[PDB]
Write a protein that binds this ligand. Sequence first.
Ligand SMILES: *[C@@H]1O[C@H](CO)[C@@H](O[C@@H]2O[C@H](CO)[C@@H](O)[C@H](O)[C@H]2NC(C)=O)[C@H](O)[C@H]1NC(C)=O
Lengths: 172, 55
Amino acid sequence: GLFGAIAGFIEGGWQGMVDGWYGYHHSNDQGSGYAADKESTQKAFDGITNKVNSVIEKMNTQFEAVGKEFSNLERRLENLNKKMEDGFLDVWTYNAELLVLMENERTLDFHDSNVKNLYDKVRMQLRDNVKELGNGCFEFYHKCDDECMNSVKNGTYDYPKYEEESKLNRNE
Amino acid sequence: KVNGLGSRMEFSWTLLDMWDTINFESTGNLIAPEYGFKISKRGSSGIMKTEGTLE
Ligand SMILES: *[C@@H]1O[C@H](CO)[C@@H](O[C@@H]2O[C@H](CO)[C@@H](O)[C@H](O)[C@H]2NC(C)=O)[C@H](O)[C@H]1NC(C)=O
């Protein structure tokens, strides 16, 4: 999209992840599998629900009674009432449709930004210990495990631990 | 002729305020009310044509 993640350098989506909106896929010696990112997903969910609550709850109520109420003695006042009804109809139709379009564009871009941001958060942490594959994956220049993967996911990853091993395997 | 008659009956109405008197006076042709209607309004509404079933 706008941030080039969804349908971008990350081609497809993951059917296997029912846990959340954005998550990880790890593939190591122990075993592969998916896992969500609760923080980013819940933040998005809170914002999105706050969005649809905004376009719904901010609408004014106003009890009114739409009808003819004007006889054939007064066809000018009928026409006046008709101009008014249609005038608002044209206003609300046009405004509502464009609102939905613009808001949907923003929403999709919003999701894109979220995935991209998670990608950057990860890459910024891993640095040159991994080979950036460009498809959304990182191939480790060392041997990571389930104990190391969780360290990446939870925000505490030890770069200098794997620095020298990664360097040697990098210039291999 | 409408319903056989060439004659007509033209009706008018009014809202008589509280503690106020109304005065009918006629030498002929008057069609008098036997009843009045007490009324109150918090607001107005409309009239709907449906043809069927209040539920
Ligand atoms: C219509 O009836 C009302 C009472 O239902 C009359 O109002 C009262 O008139 C008496 C006599 O002067 C007063 O003492 C009261 O103070 C009035 N009551 C009210 C409404 O405050 C009224 O006079 C009658 N109208 C007439 C003259 O036919």
